[PDB]
Amino acid sequence: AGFIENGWEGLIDGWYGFRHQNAQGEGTAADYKSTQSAIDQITGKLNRLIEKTNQQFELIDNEFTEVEKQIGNVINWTRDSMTEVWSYNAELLVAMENQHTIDLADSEMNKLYERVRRQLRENAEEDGTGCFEIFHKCDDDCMASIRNNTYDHSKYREEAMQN
Amino acid sequence: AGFIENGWEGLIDGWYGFRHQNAQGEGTAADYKSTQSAIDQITGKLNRLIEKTNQQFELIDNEFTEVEKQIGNVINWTRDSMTEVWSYNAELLVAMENQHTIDLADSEMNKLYERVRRQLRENAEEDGTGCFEIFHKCDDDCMASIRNNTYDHSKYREEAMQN
Amino acid sequence: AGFIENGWEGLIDGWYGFRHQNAQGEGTAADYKSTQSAIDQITGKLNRLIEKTNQQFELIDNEFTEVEKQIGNVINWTRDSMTEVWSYNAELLVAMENQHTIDLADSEMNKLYERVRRQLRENAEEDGTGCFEIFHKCDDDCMASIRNNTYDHSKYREEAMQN
Amino acid sequence: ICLGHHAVSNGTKVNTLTERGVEVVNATETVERTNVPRICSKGKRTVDLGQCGLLGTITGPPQCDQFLEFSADLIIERREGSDVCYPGKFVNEEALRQILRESGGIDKETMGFTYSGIRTNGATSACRRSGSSFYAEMKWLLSNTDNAAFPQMTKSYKNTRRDPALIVWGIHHSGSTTEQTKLYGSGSKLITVGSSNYQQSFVPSPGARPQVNGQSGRIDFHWLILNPNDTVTFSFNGAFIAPDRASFLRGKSMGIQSGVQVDANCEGDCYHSGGTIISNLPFQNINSRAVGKCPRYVKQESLMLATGMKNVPE
């Protein structure tokens, strides 16, 4: 997500998609495997995080009738230290899991990018902006064949080597 | 470990290795540098994790004769809060270091993969399943040279460009 | 920073740079975008991290006239547990952010390398030592065009395809 | 071309999740070690109690007259600061000290206690400035002239202010029963202190004690906190150190226990016995008991946060 100029706004159903701009026309489709894996990983991370505590805490301090002042300050200081360390742990965890979510999105993105590279030996190459320059013409069949991960490159090699 | 269909079960000595399927036959070998780096990093992580603490706690509550109920409940609540924060920190640490070890294995695999593609400029290309398609004939000396990081691609370029 | 043999000592102003060693002469220049992004990310991490607490504690113990020994032991044990958990959190913090800073520097290096290889379709090829081999001759304008992220690979293809 | 990064001959060793002591081009501090050995607190009101003590500000021994009723946003106590002139302890000592630390200063106002036909000017050889005297806001209620009965007194004081008052009174356990009869007379003296939330009562107990500050008997100062529109009745038959003035809280402050001198050359945040921890780092390793909004304590001597890349020498 670093070498791309901008993200698409018309991509609604899928997180990661595909555009063609071939001679047949213009089409914007959505990949399924990469976005399913990304949503599965992130939802698993959420389900790990979204978990109410098992440990049961009781009332240690009285709001109405104030407890003895020494033990009251001891309880207040213990609760304040626990509150500070919990706020610290919460902000640290939120920051690093947002970082890991962004890195996971980038990892799924360039994993799809590198698997598209692997599917296209020399029939296509990158432009640096996230697009692949196809060296063969197909009537929107090889578009879906790249999309469906059922692309055969060896039959398209002879007309793409000389170009 | 992303583009590979399945990991090898016949590899025992190392962690990352090579399969041959050449004209001489079929053979399995084990890389040494990448697995040494991975095991060194993971064992260093274990060494910095597997450490008995220096802080020496004292007995604050009495198991046999119960202490005064107010200060005893304060001790119980402090111990329960510290148990909860230590359990949360333990889950956090275990989860993030398991993620980091998985990502470290993936990154060591990726580093070996990119260094193999860097060794062989055009003599071999990926297929998407983790293999490299050699475009020259060589009887186990070139492949061991690939393993030994002593591959001389300059004397193999002439017969691999036209293919 | 994996495939690179060593870091340059003469690169002073920039973190990530460029060496050409072309026929025109010798010169070590510095990239600006990658090092600016890396320093911005690391300084943002520091500004997130270097932050005095907004919560103000009070004196719970007494240095001069020692408090009652039971509540004194409770305060000492609570402070020791808080000190131990803060020390563990601090060393975990330092370890994982040093790991993330090293990984961020490696990722910025990899992103710069990949964007250079994306600018250089076939006119240049990778080496494995972090260098690029050029199939065309060009006098310090192409090199700056690579540095300025304004490379025009369209009109270098005719003399570099056969090489 | 050749593409690469920068490095230095001498970098920094930092700790990392995989390897310990890895070499980086540059690194920064996260655990502060440099401690300012001065309580530098410019921008806030401060009082240096010195040879006076924080709890001595209430009762008023000779060392604590200057800071008898003060006002500050920072209170500083010293080890040499004594809380009492006539010897004796404080019940709930740390509770009263922590109340005074958050007082923001204290204000003394008279209770209007009128005593009829009974000598009230206490005088001890220990609590002395120029002659035999006693505390500032405490009145030692002796007998009339000599061994004589002490009439039962019922003195009621009502806190009419809008803030919760603080009342400190004293109990005299004489050095002997004969001394107690000299000062208050024969009979079992019994004293009750009554409030809405306070009803504790107690009996003075004469007996021999070691000579502390050149005196035998000990006076224990009890205390309570009065809510607004609440009254305290002292019903004492004898042997009472009556409160002439009630102490009132002023605002919010924080109390430190240091031993270094005070200046105004900083913007300090937290303080301790070694001085001031002025820094912006998240962690510190100077004192475990630094109080204020500042870095937290850690067990490690030093942690290096890698600011630069992992460098390899050429």
Ligand SMILES: *[C@@H]1O[C@H](CO)[C@@H](O)[C@H](O)[C@H]1NC(C)=O
């Ligand atoms: C302790 O904290 C509670 C808030 O959680 C506060 O209402 C209470 O006044 C505090 N106690 C003292 C003695 O400051």
Ligand SMILES: *[C@@H]1O[C@H](CO)[C@@H](O)[C@H](O)[C@H]1NC(C)=O
């Ligand atoms: C405090 O915890 C211990 C075990 O950790 C338990 O045996 C004890 O009963 C608890 N005290 C109270 C008052 O519940």
Ligand SMILES: *[C@@H]1O[C@H](CO)[C@@H](O)[C@H](O)[C@H]1NC(C)=O
């Ligand atoms: C509590 O810890 C402090 C240092 O933080 C130490 O000076 C004191 O002696 C300890 N108290 C006891 C009772 O050990």
Ligand SMILES: *[C@@H]1O[C@H](CO)[C@@H](O)[C@H](O)[C@H]1NC(C)=O
């Ligand atoms: C290295 O880091 C320190 C942080 O203490 C900083 O003051 C210094 O300017 C840095 N040096 C360079 C060359 O970045």
Ligand SMILES: *[C@@H]1O[C@H](CO)[C@@H](O)[C@H](O)[C@H]1NC(C)=O
């Ligand atoms: C306290 O008493 C005064 C006078 O009787 C009255 O004006 C005020 O409202 C009372 N306050 C409370 C809290 O009862």
